[PDB]
Design a protein around this ligand. Structure first.
Ligand SMILES: O=C(O)c1c(F)ccc2c1O[B-](O)(O)[C@@H]1C[C@H]21
Ligand SMILES: [Zn+2]
Ligand SMILES: [Zn+2]
Ligand SMILES: [Zn+2]
Length: 230
């Protein structure tokens, strides 16, 4: 799996998880440190569905170029899983390229208030904790407030891939990440909704870092509970 040390600045790598399912990996500086960040690509017939930008306009242009080089099918729709820049930063690049960009109404509102890029289309049916909707080759799920109040997770039923976004931490992360907009009180309950809804998931992708199994959900709960008590 691609890591920071393998990814030059402004570049994107793809990792094929299953037939027609990839993660995309980019890097970005934040407060002087370099972070990896993951999104998803899911084949949708002879088109592609993109989950999340690559954390900025430059990275997202590089993402589109790497998709063309390695896959060669058009990205027609994109979903942003919450309102922060690792998820919507680059939406303007996607829109200018002809991609239809989507997010929940909650995410669109929070992005506008925060001054971040705003996906065009609104995803209905995701406003109450536990809600799920189909979107092409994926299911979108709103587990409740966690890393952010609007965070969605994405499941690929054909491949048993669960993309947790920033609500799910990689195993190497043993203290809180960016929690400025987090709901610490609800985060473990929201993770439990994910576990209860996707107990069949085989391949779990965090917002940042290395994939794993469903152990990443318990790990994230452990870290979040420890932070609550600290
Ligand atoms: O997900 C994280 O915990 C995370 C982090 F650890 C450092 C910086 C960021 C993070 O994600 B974010 O809150 O979505 C935002 C782009 C910034
Ligand atoms: Zn965030
Ligand atoms: Zn993040
Ligand atoms: Zn752990």
């Amino acid at each position: 799996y691609p890591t920071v040390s393998e990814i030059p600045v402004g570049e994107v790598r793809l990792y094929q998880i299953a037939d027609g399912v990839w993660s995309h990996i980019a890097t970005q500086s934040f407060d002087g440190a370099v972070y990896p960040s993951n999104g998803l690509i899911v084949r949708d017939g002879d088109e592609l569905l993109l989950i999340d930008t690559a954390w900025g306009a430059k990275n997202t242009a590089a993402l589109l170029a790497e998709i063309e080089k390695q896959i060669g099918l058009p990205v027609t729709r994109a979903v942003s899983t919450h309102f922060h820049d690792d998820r919507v930063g680059g939406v303007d690049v996607l829109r200018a390229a002809g991609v239809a960009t989507y997010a929940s109404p909650s995410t669109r509102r929070l992005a506008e208030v925060e001054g971040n890029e705003i996906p065009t289309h609104s995803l209905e049916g995701l406003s109450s904790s536990g809600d799920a909707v189909r979107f092409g080759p994926v299911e979108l799920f709103y587990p409740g407030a966690a890393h952010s109040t609007d965070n969605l997770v994405v499941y690929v039923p054909s491949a048993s891939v669960l993309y947790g976004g920033c609500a799910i931490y990689e195993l190497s992360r043993t203290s809180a990440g960016n929690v400025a907009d987090a709901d610490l009180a609800e985060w473990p309950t929201s993770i439990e909704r994910i576990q209860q809804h996707y107990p069949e998931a085989q391949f779990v992708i965090p917002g940042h870092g290395l994939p794993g199994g469903l152990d990443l959900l318990k790990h994230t709960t452990n870290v979040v509970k420890a932070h609550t008590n600290r």
